[PDB]
């Protein structure tokens, strides 16, 4: 479905949907190519530094029940709940996506490009945020609900080892999906003219 | 030209054309509706720090004389021409973008979310990077050559005194676009099990 819908609505009609259901149609299969697609996104001098560990479904709730606990452990009793809440959104969804960004790579283009040595740390992000974009856009042309959270780096050391992930990759982000189940929140833009000059 | 193109093409045709030239259907209204289109893109919290200033024909062309000279004082003789030739690519084009990052914005951020002091200013590059990436394939789906480029931080000093940028904006990147003017250069991927892992 990411080929009847054109680029401008893909663009205007991906929302955060952070509350998703479950879904056979939305197969193991469908997210590969999701993700094949995806990694046309460009990384500074092409390094290709990122790196994608989908979680489906058992493993999928294993990862949001690995937050909760951190979470439990980490978070007054008086606000645990309150603080948990939101995770049943994503629990209850088809899958999440893990997005990392391959350190030892970042580390080797430092040292190819020392010209660029500064700046290939936030080129690191900047590339992983163009792909993490990029899996938003073709998964909601599918239609299919998606979010972006952080909850990197306390979860990290457990996603790390439970998942036998290299040291060298950093969790940036975690994209839970699935069938929507929830309307996208109202969006509010500063105007126009105050973000764009033209000389 | 956005509208023909569906996404997943969007996504697949969009390379860095490094030589543009000019043409007079690429005006400063086609560029503007690009960029309301790429504002969809989303920021951390809905911070919306990214700016953008385009510097059109005129203006374009006294950039990236900025640049050659800004170069031309930190390169040693022997060196210069080499490393000004690609310059000429970008200079021959209609126009260039800057992306800029309001730091004001991201500093308080920091200070209304403290639980994400830390991350927001890698969130602030990631929210650019994904606006660049969205103008970036908007423009290639309108049949428009562009580039990634990178003169900052050496030319952000002339730039902000040269074009009245606020002291906060940084310069994160520049956008020279135009008549496609070149052939892609061949683009080489990791093999595909080497970045994904499913579980
Ligand atoms: C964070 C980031 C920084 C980049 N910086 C530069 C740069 O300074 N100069 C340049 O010519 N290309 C730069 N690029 C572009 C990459 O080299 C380019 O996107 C990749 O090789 C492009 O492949 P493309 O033609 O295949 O799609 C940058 C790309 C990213 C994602
Ligand atoms: C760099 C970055 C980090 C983000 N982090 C979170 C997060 O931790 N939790 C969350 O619920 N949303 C997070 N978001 C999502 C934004 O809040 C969201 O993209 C924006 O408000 C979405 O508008 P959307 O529904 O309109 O398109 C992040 C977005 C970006 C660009």
Redesign the interface.
Known sequence: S???????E???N?R?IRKVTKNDAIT?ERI?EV????????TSF?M?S???????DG?HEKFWDIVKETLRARVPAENFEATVERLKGFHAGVGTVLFFEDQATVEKMQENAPL?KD?FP?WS??????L???VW??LS?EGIGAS?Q?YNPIVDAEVKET?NIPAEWSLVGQMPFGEPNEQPAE????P?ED?????
Chains 1, 2 share one sequence.
């Not at 990411?2 to 401008?8: I, R």
């Not at 992000?125 to 163009?130: P, R, S, T």
């Not at 973000?195 to 000389?199: A, C, D, G, L, Q």
């Open positions: 990411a080929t009847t819908t054109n680029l401008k893909a663009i205007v991906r955060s193991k590969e993700l094949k697609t995806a990694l046309h996104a460009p092409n290709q990122g790196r994608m560990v989908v979680l489906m493993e660029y700046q936030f992000h900047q590339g992983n945020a163009m993490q974009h990029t856009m073709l042309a972006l952080h998942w969006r509010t833009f500063l126009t973000v764009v000059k033209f000389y």
